[PDB]
Structures are given as structure tokens and as C-alpha cells.
């Protein structure tokens, strides 16, 4: 059912004819054996298709050429069962659009001390065949990945599997379409940037439909379709008295529903995966989309507030990326602090748009709905608490000449006293290593007030993403120390400054 | 005896023409003591020749003129006795083509508290005088190693001699001559490169003589001389049943012996110090040089397989580097692996060519050969085990615009079982910090399958080597971590990308 | 029959739906009309295949994806009949392996002053639609070409056609295989270099077979096949008395013939397009290949003397490139000068290997054959004079970090007195602007003694090649003036020094 099922990774084996052609026939036995046992037992994010052996230049070019042409081909994992003169690969590697991982593995785990002979020695020579390959890729500054490990090693499966994840994320982004409903909040910098650069670098496109284009779909929906969706609320969520049938703010639940249907139909018919809104342009909408934006985020779409295409895009990438994983992933603003010796905290939220995928409960749908901001009707919104434990918050910023991705490892924690006046969903966390330093470093390194929160993905996941896209990663966890942190900033600046 | 008897290090001393033939003659006295003290007591790689005092610019410029012209001057060791304003050193240091080391030292291991005068402070004042000199070395951006200590210091003797050792290596490489017998294995990358560039940088030359040429010399050796060498094989090694008289492959031993004599004679007359071969071009040679190659490696000749001049030269270099040290140093190629929790191992070896320099025993010689590779006669070889202990493998790769020296720290270990069918000698080691990262880090950095294995030389030797040549040293050892390693590869790329 | 017939160029029209879909239908009428009239009447180097209109992002990605996959697709020529929002093209353009030329043309030549209206105005808006496209390509630093001109403009056809030429040259080079028969003349720099860099940058591969591998094929040929080829000589060429049946050097014509057959069979069975020899390794050959190398160059193969793969490669590229053109293209060494007020000259040649494609006559096959060099039998060689008029000489050199292509516009001229002792073919020329300055500049800018001479190609042809491959071109013709010439060298050095 998932987008992972719309891709497969190619298992290419490198060798040469020198010994052959029955020395090849063993190689093929191994490959087919390792491919089946992985597809069967290694619980990897998507499928491995074994291609015919690459033992000549033309065979290797062929495979890369094919890999570029096949839209499901998300990456290559190459095993060099033997020596494989690396010049053979050059012409293929210079046309390759798809990512590559060397699986520096071997058929046997134990070296058969008592039996080993030259036949053996000259078969399963990945020990050196993998190093010849290492070189050309390094020589070309072509970022190839490596996992060393025996082919049944479950630790390897993970790192292999974790890489397959990024391959698919990289190709989905190459089709991701953000639909903004208006422009950036006036006078705001971070949420602005060069959209051309984004689509060049990342392949996702951002383009603006009039709020009025939406309003038209938003107004067109049938009551039959509205009251249907109104039922799915009462089913799913705790309705606060104000929200119930005879409640003075029932009518506002109707307007929420339609804005959900309206946005969903516009977004499906447009073929979109993400979107923005701006409270400075809600002409023809009854209320700022809250409930609707929250549920569309649960249903999968990327979103960010006030025109913020980068963060909205990012959310969608990290959701997709998170498929099959234990948690969350939500848009998030760092809203307010709690200061105390030992217990410094952040509380995250926005005006309304907090995704219910990181919640732990059955979730109230109250109004208590004054939003002076926007200047519209009291909006519907889901109110909830965020799950505990170790998360991350990611901010992608545009330094103008390049992008930088900041990640701050964090730990959600339970609110000690509850928030009875606060009509928004919360997320409360301690920022590794500690607020003052965590905040300082983030601020030092730019990094928006807009972030993507996530329980399901982590730092190592994001490190591979940063690699896969060739961008700087600015990491802020417990190891962070400002003198070193600053040096890195400088040294990365020169490096990525080409 | 050995090549360290060819070279010398000059012992220059720095003061000003002002003032006091006493003071200025009084200083001459100490340099004559420390030098004589060091030359009999210190056990340094080669002698220290004291030179007349650098008091004026012209004298320093002369000292440099001579130091450049004198082909056994391996470098200057400089100690700044009184105080020698560095503007005097300019014209000299500017022309100085031989390496320099500031031995930053005093007269006198401790301090006269009641016996201190201005007459004393006039003369012998390296504390400040030494610093001024570092400045100009830094300003001009020259190397200038510095060792600080009291001359009588055991630790400081050690430090200076290791430098002296490198200084001499630098000079020997200048005259090093590789001789290639055929070209690279077809379609191979790591072992190709720009010979012109290497000769510019390190000064070693690489030029190829026809396989046909060698054959002419091999086909010329007298049966008398051939037989005589075999008498040396009987006495050196453990001749296997087939190897000895009435042996089924006794002639293969003679042919090997003939080859070795021809190859030797050839190399000697052409004044060569290293060589390569290629199994793809052996026309006129009865079998692929194995035993011949091994004993020649053991006698001091650098070599590396299938046309690999870089590694071949590096072997010769490191072999000379290691002179007067306990331990082996060999050509080596990661051949296969043993994956076992806690005990990941690499079996090193080559087709035939491994140096008995690194062996534990009196070596067995066998034929049990059938080398499918090439397609020649069952060739002779020395089978043996590699010693137990700390070692390094090193590779010099050409990245197009610059060279990179990779060195992995390792620890060789007893084969836990005999290897009865392995027709070749072996090395066996655990890689620091562990196989997967050891291997992965090397692949990320490129780094040949061909390496120079050494028991005698260490990371520190190679560190100075890399500094001495201004090449990047990539270091894989117990302290390695992939995030910092990767960072260093990027931050170095832009440093040395100049 | 020619390799041009194995490729086609794609004619892609960019537009958008804004007006459509019958506004598109006109666009298609135009495109089909312009494609037919060009394929019919424009005598272009190869075929134009009109692809379906690109009016959306997915359609544009599709076309580029297809262009990469189709091996005959040599380049794209895009016409922007209307405005074509350039973001649509980004994702296609970021995957494109093939070269692109914008044909900034229009359907009508004259603006129909009296009739023009908005319908018209908004159709045929290439005036601005072409500038939107210009931008993205410029923004991406993607070297796209442009010819502006009406679509019937014959001057345009040329510049379009001239570009199509380079597209095909660029793809052939991506399959060109040099087969060296040995290594570089010892101690020679220019002919040496980094073969990995070449195959990366250019896609042609260079790899060394043993002279003995050839000798085996060289010796295997049948007399029936030898004497057959001996007849084709007497037919084609003037046989000097020494060369005739009872001539004392007839036997040497037999050995020439076999070396021709032998080299031709080895080269066809290897699938090669170019080759080198080295006189320092002719073990098993009767005489240095002269006659044979000359005729194989006429038949099409690239060649250069003494191991020189770059120049041999280049020759083959410039021959292929020259298909369908008036002249020549030959390997060439600048052999000797004539100095005289007003009449300074160069005479070009090699020991033997001068291609008879630039000759004007029926061509003597004498021996007068002492070649002390090589140390072999008196060789057969064709002796001839070169055609008059404006030519070029191209040298591709490896500056180590990058390549530079030098071109010197020259003018062949008739020898005033004849060369009765000189047993080699001549080419005599004046080097624009004049020997002293022409020689100086060439020497200043490096540039080998080995060149490719050519009557058929020129400077503008080579300028597009240099562009198509992104390398420096150092031009030396009449406009050349050393102060400016030097400045350019410096300014290009910084630019291409990334
Ligand atoms: Mn906000
Ligand atoms: Mn090898
Ligand atoms: Mn020549």
C-alpha cells in the first residue's frame, strides 16, 4: 500500500572474466542466495532486484543507464564478489542519477582455515575488490555509502535498510509539489528564500494558487459531504460542550469541516503533497484552517504556517521518510519557556496547526476560539499532549548561497501541571544539551522558529539525508560544546562555500 | 654499511655578529660540546656536523647555499643560542631546499638562582630567540619541525632522530628509480596515475623496460650461476618433496632461480631500487616472478604487483625508512576476511609476491603452484606466516590534483590453525578500531587494495613523512569515529585543494 | 554508411497550456513543418526527430529521461515557440546527460505589420520564451548553445549543423578505445598523464596489450592474405625500384604487409578505434610499423607515436568529427624549421607515420629505409607532399589538474625546392601569426611536439569541442599578441582551476 512498494533497489554484483566462466557461476549462486535470504528475512524498507552480473565496461554502463531510466529504481547496492577493475565502472558512474551503496560483504563469515586455497582466495576477494571500487568513487568525489559486515549480520541489515530509506525519500522529493495559498507573512526572513534553488537542489516545486481558487472549491462542497465529515469528528474526538449540537459554537464546526473537505479536494485534484496558508490573506474563508490542516497533516500532507514552503516541504519529506516507523513527525513552533535550576523547558505549538500523529490520547475538539490574528471566525482545533521520550526538531534554512539543516536532539516530557486555559495542543521538551546552550547554538547557526518535530526519525536518519543531498548538518545534542560548534560552522562554511 | 652513512645533518647555530668574540667564541664552545655529546651518546640515525656560527645574513645564506649544494646534507637542525634576528635568515631560508628542525634547547638543564648575571643573559637565550625564529617559519609558511627539551633528554634525542630519519628518506626518494616490466593491469584505476606528477612531488622516477628486454638477460645467465643459487635455496629454506632433487617440479625451481638472477642482474646494472611486473605481459618468461621477487624485496628492492609503481616506490621508501629498526615491511594486499564477533580478521597476501621480511620461521619453498592467472609454468614461491605484533598498512593514492596517504593501525595475530592448502604466505590482523569501520573508513577515503605492510614503522613515522611531503595523511586507528573522520575529509579537501 | 547515420538529434518544442489546445495545434503544425523542411533541404550532419510537445513539467522530464536512455540521441535542439515557464524544465535539465542547443528561431521572418494581433503576438513569442529559457540554463551554469536566426536561414543551418557535429563527436568519444602496444617512450613528459582523468572527463579508455599479444597475430597471417595486400600497394602507389619484385628490399614490403594485416585483425577483433606503438619495445616485429600505421590512419584509426595515447585518441576524434568534410586530419610532429626574412617555415613529419589523407598525389612506397631508431629492419613507408591552404594543428595536453587544448591556425604551402634525400612525407607550413610568436606562445602554453594536423576542421570547430567538453582553449592565430595571450593564460588558470 505504501510509496515504498512503488520502488525497488537494485542489487548489482561486480566481478571480472579473468577466472570465469564457472567461477562466475558460483558468484551468481551466491548473489541469488543472498538476495532471496534478504528479501525474505531481512525486513528491509523495500525490494532488492538482482541484476545480471557486471563483469565488463558495457555491462556496467548498461546497468546504470537502465537504473536512470527505471522510475522505481531508487538506488544501487553493489557487492564486489571479486576484483572488478574500477575503470570498467567509470562511464556508467558518470551517467548515474541514482544513489549507490557498497555492501562490503562476504559469502562466508568464518575463514575456512583448514580448506582455503587459491580457488577460494581468488573467489570472495571483496576484501580487495571493494577497495578498488572505493577508490574511483572517492576519486570522482562521488558520495557512495559503505556498510561492511557479513551478509546475515542484522546490524548491517539496519544500516543497509536505513540507507534504502533515504534512496526512496530522495526520489519522492523529486516529485513533491507544494501548493501555497498566498505568500509569506510580510517582513519575515527565514520562511522566504529562492524557490528555484530548492527545485534545482531538491526537485520539489513550490507554486502559489490564489486563496480565491481554494475558496471556490471550499464553498462548493455539499452538506451531505459536510455532515458526513462532522460525524467522523464526534466518533474520533472528545467534543467539548461548546462544540456539541446545541452549543453556541456548533456552526463553527460546520465551517471547519467544509474547509477540510475543500482543502482535501483541491489538494488531491492538484496532485499535491504539501501546502501553506497565510493569515494575512483569508479572503472568502470563514475561519483560518485549523482542524482541517491538523487532519490533513495526519493524513500525510506536509504543512507549515504563514507561507513557509521549506518547512512544509520538509514535513512531507520526513513523514514519507518515516513510513513504517514508531512515531510522529509534526510541524512545530518553539512557543514558550520554563526556566528553573535543573528543569529548563521548551513548550512547542502554533496558533492551531499541530499534527495529531504525536499525541497519546482521545483528543478534544474545542473552540475557546478567539483568534484575533487573521481576523476571522472562532476556529475549530484539536487539543492534545505529545508522547514522551527522545525526539528531534529539524529546521532547513536557506543561507542564500546554500542550505543548512539544523537538528536538535530533544526529550519530550510530561507537563507537571496542566494547561486549562491553553486552547492549543502542547509538546513539552528538554533541549539537549540544555536550553541556554541548545538555544544559543541554534540561534548562532540561524535555524528558524519553524521546525519539524519527530518521534520516529532521528539524528542518524537525518545525517544520511544531509549526505544524500550534499548539505551541511548542524547537530546540537549532548556532545555539543560552543567553541567546537563554532569552529565547525567556520570550517564547514569554507567547504560548502563552493 | 647502510645508506645513513651517506648523509649528514648540519648543526647550525644562531646568534648576531654583535657582540663579543669572547661571547661569540664562548658560544662556539657549547655547540662543540652538545654536538660531540650527541654524536657519541645519542644513537641517532646519522651523524651531526657542526657548522660555523650564523651571525650575519651572508653567513646564514652561505650555510644555506652549501646546505643545498651538499648532496649528503639531509637537513638542518638549528638551535638558536644567543639571539639571531630572523631578517638575517630570509635570503637563506628562502633558497633552502633541505628540511629544517628547530631544536629548541638550552645550555643547562636547570637554573642558577644565585649565579645569574647580565653577562649570562647576554649569551645563551634560546627562550626568546627561538620564538622569533618560529615566527618567520610560520610567516613564510615553511614546515620547521620543532622539538623542545634539554639536549641530554632521552625523549628529545628520540624525537630528533625520527625527524633525522625522515630527512634522509626525503633525500633517498629524490634518487629512487622504479623500473616497470610492462604496463598496468588493464581496466585498473588505483594503480594508474600521473608519473610526471609523482616525480615532481617526491622526485622518484618511473619508466618502463620491455618484458622482452628482461627476457634477454634471463635467457643469458649461466647454468653454473643458476645452480649455485639453488644451493642457497637448499640452505635457506625447507624444500618440499616436489621441490627437491628427483622432484616432479625440480626444474621449476631452476627456472625461478634463473629468472631471479636475470631480474637481479638487470636491476643492479640499471641502478634501480624498485620494480613492478604484470601477468598480462610475461612473453618470453617461463613463469611469473614469485620467489625471485620475494628475495629481491628481502634484499631491499621495493616492488608491487601488476604494474603498481606507486606502491612499489612506497615499499622501497618505507624499506629504507625502516633501516636499523626491528621489524619487516612488505608488499601486501587484503585478500579475504574472517567475521567473528569480537575477532574480525583480514588475511593479507598476494598471488605470490610477499616479502619474507615479516616472517616468523625459516621459510618453506614450494611449487604446488598451478597459477591459472597469467597462464605460465607452475611458479616457485615462499610460503610462511607473518609475525605477531603491532603493524601498519599504508597506501599512497592519486586523487588527480593531489596525493593522499592512508594509514591504518593494526595488530597481527597467530593463525589459529594451520592453513594446509593455501599455496601462499599470509598475514593476519585485526584492524583498528574494528573491521567494519577500519574497512569503511578506508573505502570512503578510497585507498588502494595494494598496501605496504610494516612491523617496524608506526603512525608517527608516517605522520612526519606526510608533513615532510605536504600530503594529506588519513588516519584510521583506535581513536577513529565516522562523523569526525568524514568531517576531516571535507575540511582537508579544501585545505590541500590549493 | 557513416557513424552519423547511427545517431539522431531530437527537436523539442517548448510551450505551455495557458492559451491552447488549438493554439498548441498550430505550434505542432509549425514544428512538423520546420522539421521536414530541414531534414529535406538543410543538408545537416544527421537526422532531426521531432518529439511531442513539452508543455508541462512531467512531459519535459519524460523527454530528457528518454534522451538519456536512447543511445542514438546525440543532443537536443529546443525551440520555444511560446513562453514556457522555465521551472517546468528544471527537473528534466538536472538529469540530462545529452547536450542542448536552443534554436532561437521564429516561424515567420517578416513581422506582418498590417495583420498582427494578440492571437499572433501570443503565439510565436520565442522572442521572450527563449529568454526565460536562457535564464535557467545560465542560472544552472549548464552550457547550452544558442543560434538565433529565422528557420530557413542558411547561415543558421551551418551553425546548427556545426553543433550537431560536436554532439556526435561527444558521444563517439564516450565509446573510443585506445589500444597501446607498450608504454611511453622513457623520460618523456607530455605524452604521459592520468588515464583515469581522461576516461572520466572524455569517456575514452586507454589500456595496454603486450607487444607479444600483437606479434602472435602478426605472425599468424597467411601468405595468401599477405600477397593479396601486396597487390593493393602496386595498384595504389608508385613503387620505387628498391621496392619492386627483384629489388634488394622487396622482402621488406612483405613484412610491412603482414604487420598491416596483423595490426588490422588485432584492432578489429579488439573493437578498437585508435592505437600507439613504442620503438623501445618491438620484440618479435620485423620492422617498426610504418606503411601499416599510415594506411590504418587513412582507414580511420587514431594513432600517435611513442605511446602517446592523448594525441592518438585526439586524432580519432578529429577524423570522426571530420566525416563529410573537405580534407585531411593526420598525426604530425614539428620536425624542422626554415628561417628567412618574410619566409619563416615549419616542416612537419614523424619517423614514418604520416597519414596519406592530406596528400595530393600518387604516392611512392620507397624504403631508403635506415631507421637506426628502434633497431629493426628497414621499414616500408609512403612518401608524399601535403595539400596547400589553411589548416590547423591541435595539441591536447594534461596540466595535471586539468586539460588544455591548444590550436594554431596555419597555412600549408608548396616546398620551393624538393626533398630528394628525405625518405618521409612532408607537410610544410607558415604558423600564424609568425614562427617566432607562434612558437613562443605555443611553448609558453605547453603544448606537445605531437599534434593533429587537419585541412577539414578549423578553429571554430575546435572552439565548440572545447566548449562541449568544458576545457580551456588556447588559440594562436593572426590576432595573437603575447601580452594579451599571457593575461588570458592567467585569467583562465584561475577560472578552470576549480
Ligand atoms: Mn508561526
Ligand atoms: Mn594485486
Ligand atoms: Mn615523435
Amino acid at each position: 500500500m505504501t510509496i515504498f512498494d512503488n520502488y525497488e533497489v537494485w542489487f548489482v554484483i561486480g566481478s571480472q572474466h579473468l577466472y570465469g566462466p564457472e567461477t562466475l557461476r558460483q558468484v551468481t549462486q551466491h548473489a541469488e542466495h543472498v538476495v532471496n535470504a534478504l528479501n525474505t528475512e531481512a525486513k528491509l524498507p523495500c525490494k532488492l532486484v538482482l541484476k545480471p552480473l557486471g563483469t565488463t565496461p558495457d555491462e556496467i554502463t548498461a546497468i546504470c543507464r537502465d537504473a536512470n531510466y527505471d522510475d522505481p529504481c531508487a538506488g544501487l547496492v553493489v557487492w564486489l564478489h571479486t576484483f572488478s577493475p574500477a575503470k570498467m565502472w567509470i562511464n556508467g558512474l558518470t551517467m548515474l542519477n541514482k544513489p549507490l551503496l557498497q555492501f562490503h560483504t562476504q559469502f562466508n563469515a568464518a575463514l575456512p582455515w583448514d580448506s582455503i586455497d587459491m580457488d577460494f582466495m581468488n573467489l570472495n576477494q571483496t576484501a580487495h575488490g571493494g577497495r578498488e571500487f572505493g577508490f574511483i568513487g572517492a576519486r570522482m568525489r562521488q558520495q557512495h555509502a559503505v556498510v561492511t559486515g557479513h551478509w546475515q549480520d542484522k546490524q548491517a541489515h539496519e544500516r543497509i535498510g536505513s540507507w534504502m530509506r533515504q534512496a526512496v525519500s530522495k526520489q519522492d522529493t523529486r516529485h513533491l509539489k507544494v501548493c501555497r495559498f498566498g505568500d509569506n507573512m510580510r517582513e519575515v526572513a527565514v520562511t522566504d528564500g529562492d524557490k528555484v534553488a530548492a527545485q534545482i537542489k531538491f526537485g520539489f516545486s513550490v507554486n502559489t494558487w490564489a486563496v480565491g481558487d481554494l475558496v471556490q472549491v471550499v464553498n462548493s462542497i455539499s452538506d451531505g459531504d459536510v455532515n458526513a465529515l462532522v460525524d467522523e469528528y464526534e466518533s474520533c474526538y472528545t467534543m467539548t460542550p461548546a462544540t456539541q449540537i446545541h452549543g453556541e459554537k456548533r456552526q463553527n464546526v460546520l465551517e471547519a469541516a467544509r474547509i477540510e473537505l475543500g482543502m482535501k479536494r483541491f489538494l488531491e485534484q492538484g496532485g499535491f503533497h504539501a501546502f501553506t496558508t497565510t493569515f494575512e490573506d483569508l479572503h472568502g474563508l470563514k475561519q483560518l484552517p485549523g482542524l482541517a490542516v491538523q487532519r490533513l497533516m495526519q493524513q500525510g500532507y506536509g504543512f507549515a504556517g504563514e507561507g513557509d514552503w521549506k518547512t512544509a516541504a520538509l514535513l512531507r519529506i520526513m513523514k514519507v521518510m518515516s513510513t513504517g516507523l514508531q512515531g510522529g513527525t509534526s510541524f512545530m513552533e518553539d512557543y514558550t519557556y520554563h526556566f528553573e535550576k535543573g528543569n529548563d523547558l521548551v513548550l512547542g505549538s502554533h496558533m492551531l496547526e499541530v499534527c495529531p500523529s504525536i499525541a497519546v490520547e482521545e483528543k478534544p475538539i474545542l473552540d475557546v476560539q478567539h483568534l484575533g490574528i487573521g481576523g476571522k471566525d472562532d476556529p475549530a482545533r484539536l487539543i492534545f499532549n505529545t508522547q514522551t521520550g527522545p525526539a528531534i526538531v529539524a529546521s532547513l534554512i536557506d543561507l542564500g548561497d546554500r542550505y543548512r539543516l539544523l537538528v536538535n536532539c530533544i526529550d519530550t516530557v510530561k507537563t507537571p501541571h496542566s494547561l486549562p486555559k491553553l486552547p492549543v495542543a502542547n509538546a513539552l521538551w528538554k533541549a539537549q544539551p540544555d536550553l541556554p546552550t541548545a538555544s544559543e547554538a541554534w540561534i548562532l547557526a540561524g535555524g528558524a522558529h519553524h521546525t519539524v518535530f519527530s518521534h520516529a526519525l532521528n539524528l542518524n536518519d537525518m545525517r544520511q539525508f544531509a549526505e544524500m543531498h550534499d548539505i551541511e548538518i548542524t547537530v546540537i545534542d549532548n556532545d555539543t560544546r560552543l567553541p567546537a560548534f563554532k569552529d565547525a560552522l567556520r570550517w564547514n562554511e569554507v567547504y560548502y562555500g563552493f
Side-chain angles (χ1 to χ4, degrees), chain A residues 1-40 42 44-217 219-247 249-285 287-325 327-368 370-498:
Chain A
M1 296 193 72
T2 187
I3 91 294
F4 276 111
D5 307 0
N6 300 157
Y7 294 88
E8 28 250 55
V9 170
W10 292 21
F11 201 59
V12 333
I13 284 83
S15 181
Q16 61 172 323
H17 288 279
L18 187 63
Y19 331 99
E22 293 279 11
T23 334
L24 288 209
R25 297 251 228 177
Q26 297 197 261
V27 168
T28 296
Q29 280 170 139
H30 292 174
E32 294 172 354
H33 184 83
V34 179
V35 145
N36 295 356
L38 293 170
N39 283 334
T40 303
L44 296 166
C46 62
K47 18 170 154 187
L48 290 174
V49 183
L50 166 68
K51 289 301 180 182
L53 292 172
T55 72
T56 67
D58 285 334
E59 287 169 325
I60 290 164
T61 299
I63 294 166
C64 305
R65 166 172 142 283
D66 293 357
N68 287 354
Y69 189 68
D70 192 26
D71 278 337
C73 183
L76 307 178
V77 36
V78 331
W79 177 20
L80 304 147
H81 203 335
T82 68
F83 197 65
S84 196
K87 270 157 70 168
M88 294 192 166
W89 293 75
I90 286 171
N91 283 33
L93 288 188
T94 53
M95 55 172 57
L96 186 57
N97 288 135
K98 264 74 189 239
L100 190 142
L101 175 138
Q102 193 201 311
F103 186 13
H104 199 249
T105 192
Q106 197 179 59
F107 198 67
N108 64 322
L111 156 34
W113 307 102
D114 60 317
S115 82
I116 189 167
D117 71 1
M118 260 306 119
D119 294 298
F120 187 96
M121 206 80 279
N122 93 33
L123 187 82
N124 8 98
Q125 48 183 335
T126 305
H128 64 251
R131 311 184 117 96
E132 221 300 66
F133 187 86
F135 169 70
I136 200 76
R139 158 62 102 96
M140 290 181 294
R141 332 294 131 123
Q142 263 226 160
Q143 280 198 336
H144 303 155
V146 256
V147 165
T148 302
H150 179 251
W151 69 266
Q152 289 189 289
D153 187 345
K154 290 166 97 166
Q155 263 192 252
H157 303 151
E158 189 82 0
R159 299 172 68 231
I160 304 283
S162 182
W163 178 93
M164 312 206 343
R165 215 156 198 88
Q166 299 302 319
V168 180
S169 167
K170 196 190 204 276
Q171 280 284 136
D172 197 64
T173 317
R174 207 115 262 288
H175 298 102
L176 201 157
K177 298 166 194 190
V178 184
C179 158
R180 294 209 288 163
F181 294 104
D183 208 342
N184 295 63
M185 197 188 303
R186 296 192 287 276
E187 302 285 0
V188 175
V190 225
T191 60
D192 203 351
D194 205 319
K195 285 169 187 80
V196 166
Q199 195 172 346
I200 290 167
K201 196 95 200 155
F202 297 105
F204 65 75
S205 50
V206 181
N207 288 116
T208 305
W209 277 256
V211 185
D213 284 355
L214 169 77
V215 154
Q216 218 167 324
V217 185
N219 292 350
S220 56
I221 9 204
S222 90
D223 306 29
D225 295 2
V226 168
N227 279 13
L229 185 63
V230 169
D231 298 344
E232 196 151 303
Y233 301 137
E234 291 169 24
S235 166
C236 277
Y237 315 120
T238 327
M239 316 296 285
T240 50
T243 317
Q244 244 87 343
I245 290 156
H246 310 292
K249 262 73 201 318
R250 214 315 177 79
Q251 221 302 306
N252 298 199
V253 192
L254 305 175
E255 299 313 294
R258 64 181 318 117
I259 293 164
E260 191 187 327
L261 287 161
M263 289 192 307
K264 178 192 125 192
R265 179 167 286 187
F266 187 87
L267 285 166
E268 270 154 34
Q269 290 177 187
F272 301 120
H273 318 82
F275 61 103
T276 77
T277 55
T278 186
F279 64 71
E280 305 188 311
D281 189 4
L282 304 162
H283 289 87
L285 302 175
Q287 41 162 120
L288 174 75
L291 206 204
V293 168
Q294 290 178 285
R295 297 198 80 196
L296 298 173
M297 267 186 271
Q298 183 206 188
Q299 283 165 16
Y301 296 89
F303 173 86
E306 44 250 23
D308 180 4
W309 52 272
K310 282 191 256 61
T311 306
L314 190 70
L315 184 65
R316 172 55 182 183
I317 301 169
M318 293 178 64
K319 279 191 172 276
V320 168
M321 191 191 301
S322 76
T323 276
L325 288 221
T329 314
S330 162
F331 174 63
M332 189 59 57
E333 201 162 77
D334 308 62
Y335 226 34
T336 191
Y337 300 137
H338 178 281
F339 284 107
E340 174 183 28
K341 290 173 176 169
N343 199 209
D344 282 2
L345 292 170
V346 189
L347 188 139
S349 179
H350 216 258
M351 312 169 258
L352 298 174
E353 308 98 314
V354 197
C355 176
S357 60
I358 79 256
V360 194
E361 35 195 13
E362 252 53 279
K363 337 142 159 170
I365 186 176
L366 174 72
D367 263 41
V368 158
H370 187 53
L371 269 206
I373 51 194
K376 302 289 151 167
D377 294 350
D378 284 353
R381 83 291 294 277
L382 298 180
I383 292 164
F384 60 82
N385 305 324
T386 296
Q387 313 225 291
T388 297
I392 58 163
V393 281
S395 153
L396 170 78
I397 56 154
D398 184 354
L399 294 162
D401 53 293
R402 60 192 191 90
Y403 299 99
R404 163 185 287 150
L405 164 76
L406 295 77
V407 176
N408 186 6
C409 291
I410 56 168
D411 281 277
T412 40
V413 292
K414 195 159 192 171
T415 62
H417 315 252
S418 80
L419 301 177
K421 302 217 106 181
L422 194 79
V424 318
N426 84 60
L428 196 73
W429 73 80
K430 313 205 81 196
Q432 266 173 78
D434 55 80
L435 250 197
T437 297
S439 60
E440 263 141 54
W442 186 278
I443 292 165
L444 277 166
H449 45 79
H450 280 171
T451 59
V452 174
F453 183 90
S454 185
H455 282 317
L457 311 161
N458 79 125
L459 176 46
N460 189 59
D461 288 342
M462 296 287 95
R463 271 224 184 78
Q464 296 166 75
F465 179 83
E467 270 182 84
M468 188 72 73
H469 287 293
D470 195 28
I471 54 165
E472 178 181 27
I473 201 160
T474 309
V475 34
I476 295 161
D477 55 27
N478 286 147
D479 286 8
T480 296
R481 278 162 158 189
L482 268 25
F485 180 80
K486 285 167 170 177
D487 285 358
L489 288 172
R490 278 119 77 169
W491 298 329
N492 283 347
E493 170 85 11
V494 183
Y495 174 73
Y496 289 109
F498 305 130

